[PDB]
Amino acid sequence: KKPPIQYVRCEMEGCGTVLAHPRYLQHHIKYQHLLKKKYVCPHPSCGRLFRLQKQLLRHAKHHTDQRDYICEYCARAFKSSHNLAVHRMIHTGEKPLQCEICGFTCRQKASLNWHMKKHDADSFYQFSCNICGKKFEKKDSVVAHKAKSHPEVL
Amino acid sequence: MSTRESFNPESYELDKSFRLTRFTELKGTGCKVPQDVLQKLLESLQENHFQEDEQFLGAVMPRLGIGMDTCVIPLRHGGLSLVQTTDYIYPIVDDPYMMGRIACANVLSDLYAMGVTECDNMLMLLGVSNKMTDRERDKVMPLIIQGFKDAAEEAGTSVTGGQTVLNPWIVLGGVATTVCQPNEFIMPDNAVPGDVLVLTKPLGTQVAVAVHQWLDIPEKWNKIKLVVTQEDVELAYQEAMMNMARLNRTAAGLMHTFNAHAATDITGFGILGHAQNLAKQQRNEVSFVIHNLPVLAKMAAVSKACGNMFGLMHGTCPETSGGLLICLPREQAARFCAEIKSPKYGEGHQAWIIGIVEKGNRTARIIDKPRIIEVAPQV
Amino acid sequence: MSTRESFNPESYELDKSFRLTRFTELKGTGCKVPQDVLQKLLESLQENHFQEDEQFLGAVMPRLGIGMDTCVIPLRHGGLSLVQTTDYIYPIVDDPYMMGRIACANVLSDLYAMGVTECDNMLMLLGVSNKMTDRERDKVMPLIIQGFKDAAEEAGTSVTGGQTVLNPWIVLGGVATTVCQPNEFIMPDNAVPGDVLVLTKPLGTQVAVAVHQWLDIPEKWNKIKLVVTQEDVELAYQEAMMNMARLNRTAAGLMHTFNAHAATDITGFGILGHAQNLAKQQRNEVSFVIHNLPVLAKMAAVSKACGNMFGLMHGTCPETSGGLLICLPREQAARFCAEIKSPKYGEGHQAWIIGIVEKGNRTARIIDKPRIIEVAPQV
Amino acid sequence: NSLKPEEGLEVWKNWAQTKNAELEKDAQNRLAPIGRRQLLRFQEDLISSAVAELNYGLCLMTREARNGEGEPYDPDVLYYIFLCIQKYLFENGRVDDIFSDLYYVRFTEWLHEVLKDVQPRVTPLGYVLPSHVTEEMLWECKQLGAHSPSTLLTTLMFFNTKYFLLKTVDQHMKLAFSKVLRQTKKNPSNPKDKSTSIRYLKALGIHQTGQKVTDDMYAEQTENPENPLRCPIKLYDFYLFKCPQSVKGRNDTFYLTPEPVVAPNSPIWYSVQPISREQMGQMLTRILVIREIQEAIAVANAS
Amino acid sequence: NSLKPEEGLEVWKNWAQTKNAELEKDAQNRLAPIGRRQLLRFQEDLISSAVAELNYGLCLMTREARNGEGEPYDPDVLYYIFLCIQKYLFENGRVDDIFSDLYYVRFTEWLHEVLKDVQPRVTPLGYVLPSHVTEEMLWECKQLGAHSPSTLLTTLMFFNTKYFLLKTVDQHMKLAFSKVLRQTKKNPSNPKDKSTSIRYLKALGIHQTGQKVTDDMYAEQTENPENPLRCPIKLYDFYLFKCPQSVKGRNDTFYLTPEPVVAPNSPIWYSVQPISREQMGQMLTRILVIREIQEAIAVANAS
């Protein structure tokens, strides 16, 4: 039932995204450019405004403490499956990422960003957040910083 | 010629529809349509059972050299060794001069993979396509010969001799040979745990070259018109043509300088294919692991969009005139890339650390989700 | 497969419609349609202006060796010279085993021309036809490798190295290299008036090969039946196969013994084609005349039926692994052939005095009405 | 010179003639390792011998080298003959070092098996028999000096065993980089003295604790202005200057495995991996046959 | 006296240093005649020098030798130095014959240019100064003997000039196979009649009207059984046993050009083409400086 693979693009100004199937174009347009709405988290004090129905379901787990992911080795608990998947690396002792200059291997891009401070590279970077000038390299990271920091809520 | 920006056929008074690549029958797998078949054939060509000779009752050095590349042959007189190779490249670039230069560099690379910075002699092979207008043959072969000779000149040697044959496809090759002392080359069987792998040239030349032949076909182009525009395709073509024409002489020199253990040339098969072949030589029980894959601008996306035609991510994409894959200790590699990036002797060129040498039973691999260090288009 | 006197395609789980020669376009003019243009290209790739350097203000011998074949390159160590050759031919014989031997012998004919009697290393090129079915490859290519390596072993060398490529026609090749002292090879430039020429192998194998390929198809065999019987194609085919697979190693050893002024190999251009090249590199003002041609039995008659495709009587008949064309003094030549015919160890072969050497303008030519000696086939 | 290559060449020629006679009388097929298909016959001249043929040939000489009168060579003179052969090879354009190069490892093992059970002979009327090998002899053969990573490592071993009085392999294995301390000890009375020496604590087993005497419990190496190329301090500093920073400041091991590939301008010659007990013992046992070291250790133990 | 190859190597090394200094000074572009694109630098050691480089250097040395400190050598000594260089090349593995090998034709011409204008080095007591070059010096090297065809030819010319007293090239050209005759003359020892000798027309004077001269007016060459490899006769028989059959019996010529390609078991070494006049002159000039021959001709003039 997998549709044959082609590629299409949304033509909305400022939207250069490309979808791996013709089907996903309508989903993308609805969920990004048409489905404009605001929701307020049910928690009394959270006060974060979300525009998708789905995002609230995840945000519900944030405020509650219903952990379900149990590590195989140390039997620790975690609040998300991918969090546990990352944690499993420690017991397995794998360091996939590797800085391409000095060969300093780590387990996450958070560490690799810290290492990049040494090999001065922020000069090459062009992107930067308009709030506090975080001086990023790519665009999705800009949205990540606007979400984690400089939040736009209430 | 090198100085000219490009090659305009009308400048040489040929037909505008003349593309040097027209003669070859290009394929995503390229010259290595099957790899296992040709791997076994190459092994058969290099198979010799009597060489063990009871190990000569000791640790007799291997005559096949790398076992699969740059065979080293001890000689009767002088205590010297014969270090020679050979490689044959079909045209993949519309510039005959640059194509001959690329062929010479590809032939020479296998010497530099063993830290041989000087080549005594080089022969040549010059195929002549049957389906090639006799008028065109006269205006192209001089350019290809000039490119080959110029590349040899830049390598501190001189092509003298060869053979000219007729084949349905243009065939270019050579035989780089060198007679050098034991203190002049590096035997690549010294890898130890904790080492790092350094790549001297970005990957993806095959994809960029093949895509340029789709820039004319409207059927194939419409497949990838979304992923990559035409201008950046042209940039990638220009750079893959320029990168494929360099020489690894500086790589060999800094290989000797910085205590390199083993190195190999990424030509055909794939980066993983050559590493696996490399791993089977090491005396120690080591296993390579590649954590990064340098690639030209806007090439991984095309590899995804073209299906299994190319296969960059998995490291099965064959390459022409690919850079060395050296094995250094960490600190030397950290110093290695900095110097090759800014060598006072010549012009700058980058180099990336792409993996580590774990402990294993002589096999390489690629992590499930390798990263793509996009190589800026010389900017 | 070695001991077997012939080939049986059915015995190897292959359909009897399998002809090894089907993978090449046999043309009467030979592997290369043009000679002067191809010769011009080979000269172009053998031409380097800086190689002269006013003779270094000294007596410097050519770095291209013969100037047309088997270049000799001085080395930095121990006053040694690097002598190497290369020549790639396509399948011309149905037998896969014997074909590899022919490819090896051809690659060494140029080396035995310079007088070198021993070889240190020997690479090879193995092109696999893309039109070849996979199951055929697994039982055809190995025999070529087997024969190539057996011929190398008989030559006193080991096939260490090689290369595999994909090419619409089977391409068999190799490079033979020797590192020898100045007192071990003959530079062919000392021809003087009053010397005779000796040919070690009968001429005209291409005729027998083409006639044997035409044997099956009647669209061309019908006419040839009148001049020559079919059975004579088979015996001549056997003789051509056997002769092309015997090395000139014994001949090279005897050139030193009997004061050989010059020698060359009749490979690919014809006896007249390689006589002009040999006479073009004699420092004296000497020319060559061919008063005889030892054609293979009953092939001369078939040559006339199609004078354009073959052109044997005129001399420009391509050959594959032909004999050496030496220039000996008349007194010694009478003994050169006598010794080669009946060697002490056995396995002798005949040789003829094709012509004489007289003062001229450094060009060869065949008399208008040369005599043809029908070398009786061995049986 | 005090080292004569002609003796080594003559010994090799005699042995090669004997071995070739043995092979030809046996008349059993055997192929040389060289590329050209040739029957294995040891070159009567050393220079033309291949790298693989030398290793097999030299190994046998340790069990089949005879003298003119026919008496087998004693271990000391046999090591001296091998030094002569090495000098010969260096003199004739060759570059291989028959003691350090990896292709010659088996020869070193056989040499160690030969020299393992060597003890002084008092058979001559003189209570001490002076060995034929000498300090200046090795210095001539380029075995000691800053020439190559292996020779430099041996040179450091030689100067430690002479001055620090380290004779058993265990004593060296106890030696660590942190323990070896270098101090200026400049004497103000001598202006611009610029004194220097490396000092090491001795492992003397005594009930009493504390520093009874600074000089008694610590050995020192003295700068030698006669030849800077022989100064132990100059070779020691050059050793550290050509070692990775990681090892420095460690207290585990002091001798580092040579890197297989080095260049005249290579910043680092050594690898962090220390040398194994087998190689350490082979190096020491050879450095315990020299006459200078032999008499030096003779002096220490007696008094 | 004997040969001292080290001294020849020293001369070559001094000249090489000076010439390389000049090459670096002029700062031109010159490429060595080898495969590698290496700037022409004259090796400080002979052995690693190519044939072209060796030829070119040897030529310039005859002008630029300045072997004596601020003093150039006389033509006599240069021959000694080049003989030493040839001995060094023989002893160090090379196979180059700087005198007769066809690749070095340019060199021998320059030596002939330097030597042809011989100026005797006279003293107040008379020109009794014997040149530094002697017969034993040439025979210690490969110049005279039966090793290569050119050496055999020069040996025959040497013996001719030393016994038949042929002091000029024109006298030599007149000699031919038929003129010289092998005589089995009766020896003083009756039981042994084996030894022969070869005689040539000499002092023939005037044959007018059958003028009578002594029946023995020739110069003989008796056997020298001290060394079989020095015998005048055995070399003559060996020479005639290697010359082409057609040559023997003629009166046109005696000295035959050697075949460029020769093997140890080659039945015939030479070619019918007789030696050139210039080659006669060069060989004679090189053979005439040797001290022994000067004495042989010296006694002739006295008597």
Next chain:
DNA sequence: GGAGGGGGGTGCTCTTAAAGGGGCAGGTCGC
């Protein structure tokens, strides 16, 4: 019968920021 569209919810890979433990480096009191 049916493949295609609509609607919904979800895991996975990537990214960034926040929290946190370890270690280097000050100032103060005691010996």
Next chain:
DNA sequence: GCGACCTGCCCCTTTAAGAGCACCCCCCTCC
């Protein structure tokens, strides 16, 4: 003069959380 103790600040790593795509599941459908 030297050390121990408390505390502050930075470094590097691990956990927590958002973005968006590819995917599945269900339902409906008019042809």
